[PDB]
Symmetry: D2
Subunit: 114 residues, 4 copies
């Protein structure tokens, strides 16, 4: 099944933050309405934040997270969780190798903000 | 029901990161085996990261997140989500006022690391 | 924080199913747009299904699950999880006593159907 | 990533329930420690319960849900959610065709029981 794709309410500010846990340099791309809106790149094996930014879901509300290492797309796992019917978390994990820890690049999208 | 308390596998490294979305200064305290292990403090209405750190769950695996503003405990909401039976997210939202956006202090705990 | 309240897409068919795990008779009430739409009642300590039904979210999309034992409201815990940005689960747990297993009445709402 | 596999605490009673939403007959197989423990079969396009049963996670705690239609494995989506660090839900969705509603066979595993 497709992973890393989330439908957010339209024209809503949301945060996107990425963490790295791999020897390989992680390239995290965030698309809004199928067009790039943010790109983070970094390397860490200690969960360092390689990027964080505030974006707007726009008219479509479509947000997609892509993760690659040296140009090769990583396998993604994702889900959205909503607490008290208000607080949203769109979560993404990714695997660039063979150990299957799926934390090589971890991306957290949260809203509402402010 | 109690919120903000999570049982992680023993002696496991995990990451904890906090974001702020409120006029009030957020004080996030993380306890491991009922003893403080990390404290983040900051203010932002734009989802700024007020802290991030790598901790160890220790022998008990008990991790508890506390959030307060000017010494008054905020109301918490939380849940744990596991993807592909490997990637874990312990999520916490908090409300310090009356608008109920529960994002005043948002805390994300993730594991495994590395 | 409020629990047991979910905003579903408008005019959408959804399923609601309740399980019981308590000595007390569980009364599960489901409200759509603040008006009762379904009521299940039963007793079991072996997770028996005390009710299942197909409802429509209607114009408001507001769905609220209430659980009580002998007229006393139980304490609720809840969350919504979305898989592959399509499959939705609105989950509710409830505690009628002191052991805090929160399974006395477990309610699962799922959509889409068909 | 692998889906439909969950690690439950050892020797713990859990419930497993399946719903159907497809023209095709759904065959849901539940394995405990890689050995079949339950099999449900049924057809419905109205979310009918095609099976529910109480099982024990056993010594390994390994539980895997498989779904097939006419012998062809369906594509699975899954996740585990824990509320108030006590109530567990292992969720599975499946797609047997091309519309991607992933509800053709929906499986819910919950614990603790009693
Ligand atoms: O070379 C990449 C890789 O093996 O790096 C070490 C660990 O972070 C792994 O999970 C990751 O797949
Ligand atoms: O004064 C605190 C408060 O009102 O600040 C503005 C918003 O972030 C609110 O959600 C928050 O409760
Ligand atoms: O008398 C009610 C109660 O104690 O019944 C036995 C168990 O199911 C408990 O969790 C429940 O709170
Ligand atoms: O023939 C199988 C199928 O098309 O049946 C009707 C709907 O339930 C669909 O989602 C399902 O994939
Ligand atoms: Ca890896
Ligand atoms: Ca890794
Ligand atoms: Ca607030
Ligand atoms: Ca706020
Ligand atoms: Ca109880
Ligand atoms: Ca009980
Ligand atoms: Ca289908
Ligand atoms: Ca279907």
């Amino acid at each position: 099944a497709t992973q890393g794709v989330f439908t957010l309410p339209a024209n809503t500010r949301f945060g996107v933050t990425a963490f790295a846990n791999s020897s390989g340099t992680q390239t995290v791309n965030v698309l809004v309405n199928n067009e790039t809106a943010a790109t983070f790149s970094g390397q860490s094996t200690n969960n360092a934040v390689i990027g964080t930014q505030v974006l707007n879901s726009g008219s479509s509300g479509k947000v997609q997270v892509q993760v690659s290492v040296n140009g090769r797309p990583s396998d993604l796992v994702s889900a959205q969780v909503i607490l008290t019917n208000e607080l949203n978390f769109a979560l993404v994990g990714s695997e660039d190798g063979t150990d299957n820890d799926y934390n090589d690049a971890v991306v957290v999208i949260n809203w509402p903000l402010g």
